[PDB]
Design an enzyme around this catalytic site. Structure first.
Site, mmCIF file in Angstrom:
data_model
loop_
_atom_site.group_PDB
_atom_site.id
_atom_site.type_symbol
_atom_site.label_atom_id
_atom_site.label_comp_id
_atom_site.label_asym_id
_atom_site.label_seq_id
_atom_site.Cartn_x
_atom_site.Cartn_y
_atom_site.Cartn_z
ATOM 1 N N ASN A 144 0.877 -1.177 0.000
ATOM 2 C CA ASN A 144 0.000 0.000 0.000
ATOM 3 C C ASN A 144 0.906 1.215 0.000
ATOM 4 O O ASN A 144 2.103 1.053 0.240
ATOM 5 C CB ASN A 144 -0.917 0.062 1.245
ATOM 6 C CG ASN A 144 -0.222 0.275 2.566
ATOM 7 O OD1 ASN A 144 0.877 -0.261 2.822
ATOM 8 N ND2 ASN A 144 -0.800 1.146 3.387
ATOM 9 N N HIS B 33 5.953 6.265 -6.979
ATOM 10 C CA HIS B 33 6.198 4.963 -6.395
ATOM 11 C C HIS B 33 7.568 4.815 -5.754
ATOM 12 O O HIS B 33 8.597 5.218 -6.303
ATOM 13 C CB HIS B 33 5.925 3.859 -7.431
ATOM 14 C CG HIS B 33 4.494 3.869 -7.890
ATOM 15 N ND1 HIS B 33 3.584 2.946 -7.417
ATOM 16 C CD2 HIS B 33 3.836 4.776 -8.650
ATOM 17 C CE1 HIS B 33 2.417 3.285 -7.948
ATOM 18 N NE2 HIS B 33 2.521 4.366 -8.709
#
Length: 197
Positions: free
Chosen positions: A34, A45
């Site tokens: 998550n 990311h």
DNA sequence: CAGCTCTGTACGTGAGCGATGGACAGCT
DNA sequence: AGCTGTCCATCGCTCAGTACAGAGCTG
């Protein structure tokens, strides 16, 4: 108090989500657990400092140069790599997530993998594969292992490959060096699939 | 008894943040 | 020579899943 997010409260970050970076015909989809606080903050990311992903991607030869979170949108086109997470909700660590959230995540994830059908679904974290295996394959082994799993995503040719989490929270693989073996084997598996096809 | 699941806990490394104080230049 | 304030090297503190033991449950 310690300001880790340039004046943005932890409470605000907890409401943020991280967009998927997915396309069709990908070789690899990196499936995180998550978003952590920094990924929610940045909207990219695996940003640093407490994460080994970008370092391992370079050290393994999966990227020819050292990349960082800002390069994440370039990965599908240049490297055939995409990104998702098992759970959408942002938390400081994986331990704050409930079983129901993980199982909801698993259902949405198998649906996404059935849509995009990457050559390899990479579980960046043993914990999420533990849940996924039980939920999707109905399999729970005593000694779950890393690497290539003996199960394909249902109704696809997508393989499942498991790695210890790139989070530096994990003491068992304390350095990026200790995880790079799994990224090298991932590259070898990718190159091998692209050999036959 | 013997498996199983569930919860609590401990664990190594390298990096950002905030505090500290030595080195040093600018002033008189 | 004496004073003062900035710079910045350096340090301590905190932070970013997994294995495993033991309790509780059940066959």
């Amino acid at each position: 108090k310690v300001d880790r997010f340039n004046g943005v409260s932890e409470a605000e970050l907890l409401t943020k989500t991280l967009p998927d970076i997915l396309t069709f015909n990908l070789d690899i989809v990196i499936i995180g657990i998550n978003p952590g606080l920094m990924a929610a903050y940045k909207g990219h990311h695996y940003p640093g400092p407490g994460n080994h992903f970008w370092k391992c991607l370079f050290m393994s030869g999966l990227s020819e140069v050292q990349l960082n979170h800002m390069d994440d949108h370039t990965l599908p086109g240049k490297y055939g790599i995409g990104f998702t997470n098992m759970v959408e909700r942002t938390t400081p660590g994986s331990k704050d997530l409930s079983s129901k959230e993980f199982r909801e995540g698993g259902r949405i994830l198998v649906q996404k993998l059935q849509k995009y059908q990457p050559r390899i679904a990479v579980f960046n974290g043993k914990c999420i594969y533990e849940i996924f295996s039980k939920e999707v394959f109905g399999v729970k082994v005593k000694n779950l292992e890393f690497g290539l799993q003996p199960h394909k995503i249902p109704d696809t040719e997508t393989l499942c490959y498991v790695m210890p989490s790139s989070s530096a929270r994990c003491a068992q693989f304390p350095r990026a060096q200790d995880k790079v073996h799994y990224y090298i084997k991932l590259k070898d598996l990718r190159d091998q699939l692209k050999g036959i096809e």
